[PDB]
Each structure stands twice: as structure tokens, then as C-alpha cells.
Symmetry: C3
Subunit: 114 residues, 3 copies
């Protein structure tokens, strides 16, 4: 899995341990081993949500499988909860694009997962 968060919250507002917390929680939610989880947080961004520059986040979660209606609702509750608790971002100012990657379309370790 690959989880990317882009946010206008400043870097100093991202707590220490946040990437680890995301890695651990995504491993448990997706069922994937933690060694395959990649996380990326980009603060201090120039963005707006609904025309407003109040705290917001634009994110994406890609995975080879483990993407679907029920699973994605569960991931949204988890990830919006973490963004609210740790970055003080309201859940209604968060978008998460979920995408299911074919194993043949994911490069890793000089090859693909197909």
C-alpha cells in the first residue's frame, strides 16, 4: 500500500511518530504486512477545500487489492480520525482517492509484483 497526505497544516503541527502511526494502522486495516506499507506526508501546502484555506487534506491510498466499498469506508473512518486527532483537520475537509493497482502495474525491486 502507498498512502500520501498533502495538507496546508504546517510541518511543526505534524507530531513526532506520525509516519509510524500511519504505517501501523494501515497494516492492520488492510491486512498487509507492515514491510509493504509506504507513507508520505507533505505539509505546508498551498491548497483550498471548498474555496477555504482552513486546515484540509488531499490524500490517496493505493493498494494491490484490499480496495472496495466497505473496506474504503473503514479506511476513511480510520484515516479521517487520525488526521483529526493528530493534525486537527476536520473530516469534512479531507478527500481520499482509493485506487486498486494491478500487480503487473506496480514496480518494486527491479521488477513488478505480477
Amino acid at each position: 500500500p502507498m498512502f500520501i497526505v498533502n495538507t496546508n497544516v504546517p510541518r511543526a503541527s505534524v507530531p513526532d511518530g506520525f509516519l509510524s502511526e500511519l504505517t501501523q494502522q494501515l497494516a492492520q486495516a488492510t491486512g498487509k504486512p507492515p514491510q509493504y506499507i509506504a507513507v508520505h506526508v507533505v505539509p505546508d501546502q498551498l491548497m483550498a477545500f471548498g474555496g477555504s484555506s482552513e486546515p484540509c487534506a488531499l490524500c490517496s491510498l493505493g493498494s494491490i487489492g484490499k480496495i472496495g466499498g466497505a473496506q474504503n469506508r473503514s479506511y476513511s473512518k480510520l484515516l479521517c480520525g487520525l488526521l483529526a486527532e493528530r493534525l486537527r483537520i476536520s473530516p469534512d475537509r479531507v478527500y481520499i482517492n482509493y485506487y486498486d493497482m494491478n500487480a503487473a502495474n506496480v514496480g518494486w525491486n527491479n521488477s513488478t509484483f505480477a
Copy 2:
């Protein structure tokens, strides 16, 4: 909808009001209310387009529906016009990836849009 522009144009060259201008124009173009439009501008990037580093932009526009051949041509004229007028980027140095998201694959407010 979610619009992202990554550019090598410096931050000081992004005019005041640009995010609001993008939010308004994308609300009119997609027909979606401005409260549902998210915009993200990332200046000062290290990029090249066609092997050169004159001003350029790599962008994406995601929407739940409102994505198609004719609509995408209209969006390109609008967004290339805005990038040329406000950031002085030639339209032939702009790529925009359009993507149609399923509602069940977009997380927002602790759930999805399904």
C-alpha cells in the same frame, strides 16, 4: 473535484487569488458546487517538460463523473488558459491527467461518497 498543479514557476509568481479563481472556474466547468472543489498548487518544483526547464505544469483533475472526451477538451482550454494568463506557462508545456473516480473510491467525512 480535486485539481492539482505541480510547476517549476516560483511561489512569488503565483498571484494572490489564484486558488479562489481555480475553485470558481472549476465549479462552473464541472457544474459541481464550489464547496466540493479542492485545489492544490505546488510551485518551485524540479521538473522538465520535453527536455527543457522553461515554465511548465504537470496537473491532474479528478471528479466523480463529469469526465469525458468533450468535457476534458473544455477543461483543458479553461485550465491551460488560466495557467498561461496567471503563471505565464505555455499551453504546450502543460499535461493534465483527467480521472473519473467511482463514488465508493472517494473517502470524505469518515466514509465515502457511495
Copy 3:
């Protein structure tokens, strides 16, 4: 084609000529002219791979065609090779998302490639 590399390697560790090297190698690999190759490198990122903040990279390669099982394995060997040799990133700490864009979903020069 559009190639983006996001990495925690510092900016000073990106060699001069890297964008040109990626442009030429991707033009040769995809068979497309270098004039249509866009490259984007984002260093100094707050990211983890497998819970670790050792050097890593999260990348994507989009193209209108030239995406498939065998081609992607070849691209992965090429791009992991360049990231290892030029940025000192281990190939097992690199993910590359390959995506095949429809020409009508790629905006350029006030229209699309359809």
C-alpha cells in the same frame, strides 16, 4: 509520458543532469520522442517505506499506451537501476505505479490527445 519521483533523499544528493538523464532514458524505453517526456523529482520528503526512514522512493509513470506486464518489468529494472546508481536508493525501497492513460483523458495545449 509523465514520470514523478518523490523521495526522502536530500536535494543536494540529486545529481546535476538527473532530469536530462531520466528524459533520455524514458524516451528510449517508451519509444516516444523526448519532446513528449515530462519528469518531476521531489526530494527532502517526509516518507517511510516499511516503517523505515532509510532512503526510499514513491514514483509513478503514466503513458498513453506502452504500459504492460513485460514493458513494466523492463521499466522497473531501468528506473530502479537509475535510482540506485544516482540517488543510492535500494530497489526494494522503491514503488513505481504504472498507469495507461486514454488519449481523451490527457489534456495538453488547450485540448486533449484524442
